[PDB]
Amino acid sequence: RFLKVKNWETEVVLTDTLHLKSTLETGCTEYICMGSIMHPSDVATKDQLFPLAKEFIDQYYSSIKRFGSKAHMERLEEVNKEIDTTSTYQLKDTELIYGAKHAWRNASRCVGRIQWSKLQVFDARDCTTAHGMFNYICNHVKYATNKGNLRSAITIFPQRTDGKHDFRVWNSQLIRYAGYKQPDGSTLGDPANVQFTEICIQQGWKPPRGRFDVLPLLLQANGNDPELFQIPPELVLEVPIRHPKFEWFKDLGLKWYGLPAVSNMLLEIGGLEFSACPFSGWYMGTEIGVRDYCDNSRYNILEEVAKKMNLDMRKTSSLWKDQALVEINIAVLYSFQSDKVTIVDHHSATESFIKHMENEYRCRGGCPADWVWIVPPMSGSITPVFHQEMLNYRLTPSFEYQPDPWNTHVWKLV
Amino acid sequence: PRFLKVKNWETEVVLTDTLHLKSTLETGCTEYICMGSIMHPSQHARRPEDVATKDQLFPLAKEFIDQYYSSIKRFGSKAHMERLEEVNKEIDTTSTYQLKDTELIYGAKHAWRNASRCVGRIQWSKLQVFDARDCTTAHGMFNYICNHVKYATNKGNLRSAITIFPQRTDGKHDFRVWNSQLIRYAGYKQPDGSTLGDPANVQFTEICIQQGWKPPRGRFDVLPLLLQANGNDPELFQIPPELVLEVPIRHPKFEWFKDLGLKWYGLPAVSNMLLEIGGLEFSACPFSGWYMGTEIGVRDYCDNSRYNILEEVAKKMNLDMRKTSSLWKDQALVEINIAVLYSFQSDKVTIVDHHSATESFIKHMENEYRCRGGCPADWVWIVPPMSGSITPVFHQEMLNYRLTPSFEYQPDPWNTHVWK
Ligand code: HEM
Ligand code: HEM
Ligand SMILES: C[C@H](O)[C@H](O)[C@H]1CNc2nc(N)[nH]c(=O)c2N1
Ligand SMILES: C[C@H](O)[C@H](O)[C@H]1CNc2nc(N)[nH]c(=O)c2N1
Ligand SMILES: CNCCCc1cc(C)cc(N)n1
Ligand SMILES: CNCCCc1cc(C)cc(N)n1
Numbered sequence A: 001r002f003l004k005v006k007n008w009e010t011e012v013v014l015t016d017t018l019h020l021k022s023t024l025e026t027g028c029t030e031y032i033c034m035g036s037i038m039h040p041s042d043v044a045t046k047d048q049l050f051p052l053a054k055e056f057i058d059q060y061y062s063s064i065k066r067f068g069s070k071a072h073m074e075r076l077e078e079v080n081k082e083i084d085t086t087s088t089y090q091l092k093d094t095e096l097i098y099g100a101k102h103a104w105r106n107a108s109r110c111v112g113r114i115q116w117s118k119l120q121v122f123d124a125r126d127c128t129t130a131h132g133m134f135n136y137i138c139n140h141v142k143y144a145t146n147k148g149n150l151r152s153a154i155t156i157f158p159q160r161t162d163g164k165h166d167f168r169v170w171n172s173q174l175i176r177y178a179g180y181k182q183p184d185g186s187t188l189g190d191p192a193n194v195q196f197t198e199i200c201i202q203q204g205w206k207p208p209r210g211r212f213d214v215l216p217l218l219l220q221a222n223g224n225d226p227e228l229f230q231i232p233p234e235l236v237l238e239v240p241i242r243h244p245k246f247e248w249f250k251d252l253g254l255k256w257y258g259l260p261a262v263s264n265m266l267l268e269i270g271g272l273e274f275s276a277c278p279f280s281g282w283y284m285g286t287e288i289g290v291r292d293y294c295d296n297s298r299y300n301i302l303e304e305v306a307k308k309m310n311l312d313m314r315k316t317s318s319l320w321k322d323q324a325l326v327e328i329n330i331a332v333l334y335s336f337q338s339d340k341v342t343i344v345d346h347h348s349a350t351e352s353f354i355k356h357m358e359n360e361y362r363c364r365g366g367c368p369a370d371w372v373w374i375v376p377p378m379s380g381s382i383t384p385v386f387h388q389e390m391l392n393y394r395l396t397p398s399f400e401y402q403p404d405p406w407n408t409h410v411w412k413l414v
Numbered sequence B: 001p002r003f004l005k006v007k008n009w010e011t012e013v014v015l016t017d018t019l020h021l022k023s024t025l026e027t028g029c030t031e032y033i034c035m036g037s038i039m040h041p042s043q044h045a046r047r048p049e050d051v052a053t054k055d056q057l058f059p060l061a062k063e064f065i066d067q068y069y070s071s072i073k074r075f076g077s078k079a080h081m082e083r084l085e086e087v088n089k090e091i092d093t094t095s096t097y098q099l100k101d102t103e104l105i106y107g108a109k110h111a112w113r114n115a116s117r118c119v120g121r122i123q124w125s126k127l128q129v130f131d132a133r134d135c136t137t138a139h140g141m142f143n144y145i146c147n148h149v150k151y152a153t154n155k156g157n158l159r160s161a162i163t164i165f166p167q168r169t170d171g172k173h174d175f176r177v178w179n180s181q182l183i184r185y186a187g188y189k190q191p192d193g194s195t196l197g198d199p200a201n202v203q204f205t206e207i208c209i210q211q212g213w214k215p216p217r218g219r220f221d222v223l224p225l226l227l228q229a230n231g232n233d234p235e236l237f238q239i240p241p242e243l244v245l246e247v248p249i250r251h252p253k254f255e256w257f258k259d260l261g262l263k264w265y266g267l268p269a270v271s272n273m274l275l276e277i278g279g280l281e282f283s284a285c286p287f288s289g290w291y292m293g294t295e296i297g298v299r300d301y302c303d304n305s306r307y308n309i310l311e312e313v314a315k316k317m318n319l320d321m322r323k324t325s326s327l328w329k330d331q332a333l334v335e336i337n338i339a340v341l342y343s344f345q346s347d348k349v350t351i352v353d354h355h356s357a358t359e360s361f362i363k364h365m366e367n368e369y370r371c372r373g374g375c376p377a378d379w380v381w382i383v384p385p386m387s388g389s390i391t392p393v394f395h396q397e398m399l400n401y402r403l404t405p406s407f408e409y410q411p412d413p414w415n416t417h418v419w420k
């Protein structure tokens, strides 16, 4: 069986055979599409783990042209031994690297996947304490930041065992700014992080109470209560935002951090669950300029920018929001480029994704892709992905969402 | 199971959908694959190829009549049972049946109500329905369409309307409007290789010329109507220009913008879709409303395989066009959409910006969840093609499913018509 996808701007048609390899739910049914649901909705038994592990080992030995080899059969046998005796198993280094890259390659919501095979994998499965996690994460940040010449990386902590000894980074990203609700109902800093800021303050963090306080790391090892650590400031690269034409823009006092690093997701490889696996790349400009700065629930600077632009803010149909949004996004890109911090604009990024997508169809039989997430949050139809049909399905290895740790952790102190 | 929630991530409002339990045909998606960005994911239809047997048509007829009599707090009433028996005899003796005027109006309005790709549906029950089922010729079709266009245009105070020509019978006698919209501009393949006018319409424009249309060969030549009645060869008709309201595009600050010489028509009137009610297929059912500005200014003017005028606007704005990261395309894109909205509003032609339209749709969703238990919506199509996330629909989860009556796509008639 085959499925065709068409680009309505170029008329190119690609043929997806890879979707036959999926085996997890999309959330949709034959009569309902849930393609726009954010999350369409504790450990595997021995019998469940066996075929998951086999499927992965089979896929890895196939990836390296060794399917059916004596080394393939011996690995299968070895894995079955571990599951039988210990109810789990341990990946080889080569399998871990392969699995981490393919979770990225399989990430249907990610437009930056042309880069998937250039991922630096840091094996942290020997870590046992939150201090050790802090060390590993500092090394990751320093390596990935590379003085502005950003390099993709992931650090992988010990896999889940019984579910009572999970490793977790409680932060949603490694570097994010604090948010403080004020008595008058206003918000200082990032409104998205108000809740996590409260948790930190409660654990003993002394907040500077400013607009751009880098949050501390809150790190949990082996199921223990999480612990606070301050990332050394010299490892946090930041970019002050200015505009190439509006000299007043710098007077907004805006800045952002250079390294985007998701730390709250779960990496599944061969049925094993890596609940702490922070990974980092580099920014597409609209992530900061459209969402981070201009979401109503975020920094929400459209009004102030539009005021300084003297826009007619009485009618929506003046498109003052649209005009201000573009300029903010110009500033963001000009600022990172001036400081020689890696960043990609949404036009360049989506153009590379189409080339990546077509290469994937040729060499792999397809490329699962989430149009709802791939299309940038501004100027959608002037990017090539808008006109690109895409098929969404779930391949494993994969990155998965997981409950926030403060909703499931049971505390131990006092 | 028997309820699905959708969340708005800006407001945290959650809505609970039970209406999807009434969905009739396949979305194309499965457990394992989502086809939500496929233009035509499914060929699942309610009636086969053409002239159905009794056991194929009657169950669909009964379902629609049942739904209509339930809608008006009857069901099982005397008139409902007689209507069932009347449709039964009509199918028995003609292999089809005829809708009452009330059923036809109910069906048209509910096809619009069920149109998951339409952001305009808060207006769904305010639709003027012109019954053109007595039409027999392309000349009569022309007369019906002129009246529709004049009524709908209403000197700029646009009014939504649909004109419904006779239903399909055996599939060799279809009524068709060959135009994709009642009013579009021609597109001309130039000798060097470029394209003059609207590149979307090059094929249709060439069919028209091949049918004896004499093209003025300009950038905004209103195409003729190409009308097909009762399966005969289609015939060309020129819409009287006084019925075709147009808006010259100017900009409220760039005085040079008018010198671009751009304009657009006021009336968007889709004429290539198929209206399905109770198993009956109306292959010619032109419907019109009024524009959301982005439809002209983002897609019509700025798509690559359309008018592609970002280039010119950008030069005149003196933007840096060396690299993409200057966002010169984004910047010109905004100015063009400002001009369009300013131009329509200045001439008092109905138009809605994408901020107002998406706000109305969120309110329409809330209304529909409250009274109907759900609202089918296609996020891929509802979210505007610019500034997506500063509109409220971007942050609104939506469920998509296929309710009947409905508007369906159908093949372009020149791929299927056997000429005489
Ligand atoms: C290298 C440059 C990269 C770029 C430009 C990029 C870009 C993006 C963008 C724009 C999104 C949408 C995120 C949002 O709007 O919140 C995204 C999502 C995602 N990316 Fe990439 N990314 C990059 C690297 C990576 C790497 C290295 C990984 C994993 C090793 C990764 C995995 C993911 C995943 C799992 C998501 C989905 C996150 C979610 O659903 O919340 N990406 N990426
Ligand atoms: C009254 C104001 C209306 C507005 C502002 C509006 C807006 C829109 C927009 C922006 C689209 C996306 C189409 C595109 O981007 O090409 C659309 C699609 C659609 N609308 Fe509405 N619409 C209106 C009236 C109507 C009416 C009166 C009907 C039917 C009686 C209708 C039925 C549909 C259908 C069936 C589609 C899908 C068409 C397709 O897939 O090509 N709309 N509408
Ligand atoms: C591939 C993609 O589905 C296709 O280009 C769609 C996307 N969303 C759209 N949305 C609207 N309103 N109009 C369109 O033509 C499209 N095109
Ligand atoms: C409701 C909707 O699914 C939600 O707002 C999505 C839409 N598309 C997105 N696309 C990206 N890249 N990031 C997002 O957070 C979202 N949010
Ligand atoms: C959930 N989205 C937040 C940030 C997503 C992301 C991740 C990565 C690795 C790079 C990037 N540019 N963006
Ligand atoms: C492919 N759709 C083109 C036109 C869509 C449309 C239809 C109607 C009735 C109104 C509107 N504002 N837009």
Ligand SMILES: [Zn+2]
Residues within 6 Å of the ligand: A028, A032, A033, A034, A035, B029, B030, B033, B034, B035, B036
């Ligand atoms: Zn789907």
